[PDB]
Design a protein around this ligand. Sequence first.
Ligand SMILES: N[C@@H]1[C@@H](O)[C@H](O)[C@@H](COP(=O)(O)O)O[C@@H]1O
Ligand SMILES: N[C@@H]1[C@@H](O)[C@H](O)[C@@H](COP(=O)(O)O)O[C@@H]1O
Ligand code: NA
Ligand code: NA
Lengths: 366, 366
Amino acid sequence: GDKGIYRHYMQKEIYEQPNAIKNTLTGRISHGQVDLSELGPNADELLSKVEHIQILACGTSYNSGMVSRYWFESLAGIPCDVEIASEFRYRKSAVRRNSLMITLSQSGETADTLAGLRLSKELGYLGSLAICNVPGSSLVRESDLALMTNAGTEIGVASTKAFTTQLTVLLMLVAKLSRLKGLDASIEHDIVHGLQALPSRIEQMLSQDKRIEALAEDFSDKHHALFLGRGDQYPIALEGALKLKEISYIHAEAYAAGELKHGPLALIDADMPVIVVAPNNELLEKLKSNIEEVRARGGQLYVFADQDAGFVSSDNMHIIEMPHVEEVIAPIFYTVPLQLLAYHVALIKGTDVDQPRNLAKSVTVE
Amino acid sequence: GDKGIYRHYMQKEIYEQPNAIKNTLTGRISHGQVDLSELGPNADELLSKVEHIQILACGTSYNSGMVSRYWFESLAGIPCDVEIASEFRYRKSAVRRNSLMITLSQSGETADTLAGLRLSKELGYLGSLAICNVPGSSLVRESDLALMTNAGTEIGVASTKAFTTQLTVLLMLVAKLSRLKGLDASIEHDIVHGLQALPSRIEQMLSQDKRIEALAEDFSDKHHALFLGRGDQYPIALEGALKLKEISYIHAEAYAAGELKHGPLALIDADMPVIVVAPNNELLEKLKSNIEEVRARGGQLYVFADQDAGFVSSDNMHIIEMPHVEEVIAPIFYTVPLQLLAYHVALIKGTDVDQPRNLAKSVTVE
Ligand SMILES: N[C@@H]1[C@@H](O)[C@H](O)[C@@H](COP(=O)(O)O)O[C@@H]1O
Ligand SMILES: N[C@@H]1[C@@H](O)[C@H](O)[C@@H](COP(=O)(O)O)O[C@@H]1O
Ligand code: NA
Ligand code: NA
């Protein structure tokens, strides 16, 4: 494909996010409501019968499914389980009643994910839905239903727009299910308004790629990093650490923010910066208290946070202020600074951003 | 307490595992069947109504719950979800129908776990069961039912016998539920036979603390490690990496074995040994193929495996042969070499095994 003004496909793909998200919403928002009529005329009968959602995926696609679990449960009130596809395909699982199988895949060809879908056909699920970026791929062809992300081809080996568009489709599905369950109409309106505003917020943020370049300079010589997030931001911490592993080759590990004290705190020093993704005040107070315990070793927190929270930087706590955004789309929004941080560290180090060592665009063979 | 012949409480506690496990089984095996009559006369009516199990815990107690999920699903055919207690207490969850809430805690006082139990009382669970090592603790007092692990007091800040005894109680519960559900009696017999044989197998293994001392020498100068496991051994990989973080301060990270290619492979080199916990042949073939991709960087696999698998060491794949054991108790069995590996690295480095920097026996205050 053509990179145009971008140095790398992955860079182009990060900057395409606003347009990719706009494109994923196209035709699916009708009169302020999510319109998934592309699924056909029996889609709602199937979807209304759903009492549990099972999501299978690998790599970055597992991280978007993990965010969505918080949304399906807290917003649509539907039990949701998300699992690495290789874990699912090799174990004897207990299928839940009226369970919908959802696969997430940029390529639609990942061997483990495809194996999970094929296996599920014999396990008693209500049916399957493929959320994918490649039309006519195996996962799309073999699922009962498919919702394409419409992000355009993604050439970077590491997924960027495929992830945020997966999150966009997932959030539309949460909205549609909250309505099929006859839940408060505000749930869907909040989602629609958050989604429609998203492209322009990301565009805004993409223009402030300077505080990110500076943090990148701080991380470019580090060999370890700890990414922390709570709730729907924990999977964003997962994706941020995965991105730093993928293209900068730094040993970045994500962890639930509430578990820092249960192990990882013993590792922290000046060579292992701790990144916190969008904490509320109560959480940041606990984390600051934890970082104070490792002050003697130079432990530092780097916090991406809503400017409205009023956090103030200190010598070992650096607030990277972000514009206030709608809570419903916050996980999508906070992904972007972490993609850019990895990209900038990779640029500084001169690593192969588009084809990182030992990784593949899709693992299609066992 | 008294260490006797041991240098450290944690060392004593690792070596107490056979006796601790024997003690946890005491009074609960009657005529080849699990006897949980200590729960009272209404216990089985409650337990028979269970259609879903929710487990909450933190730290090492989350890892034992994670192993048990595989057992509840594959053996008792009961849907099981396990979550970090801080994640549970801060999110609006979708409670499943006829769900049993189980908390795992050595101390019975962890603030997040206790918060999760208290919150659950208002969320519609069928009831609660506390699996704990400290009698009369808050979690025990506030739960409907309690099964004590009976491991004796655990003084080491890092949990060892509390973890394997939690696994022992969990496996007895899996057996009891398979019987209440009228499943094949062999499930329970397998579990009982595996459990009754466990103390003596661990004792056997504890006598071969020499191949472990040698591997410890190989890891003592490393600053990174990747622990891999599939299925019921993935949580054992989690516990092994947690132990290395806890008492050796090495940046050890666990990962599902099927996800190595999806990111972490790019990090591997001579300074990041990869440990594989009890793989079958098909999995080891894939992992050997992955390690071959990083041969130029000196990537090496260290594999704890059943001698019966017939694996043979090569220059970049070191088989640490273990006696064949009953599959049902394999996760418990393979924990021991990983506890000893961390303990031996800690001994070499001279770190504070019993009171590792920045960690606490229990986080009882918010
Ligand atoms: N490098 C890619 C990742 O970016 C991707 O997340 C994963 C899953 O692929 P897919 O989403 O196509 O299923 O595969 C590879 O590891
Ligand atoms: N150092 C301990 C760990 O060993 C333990 O796993 C965790 C949970 O404590 P508990 O099992 O008592 O709930 O707390 C602390 O972090
Ligand atoms: Na939240
Ligand atoms: Na298994």
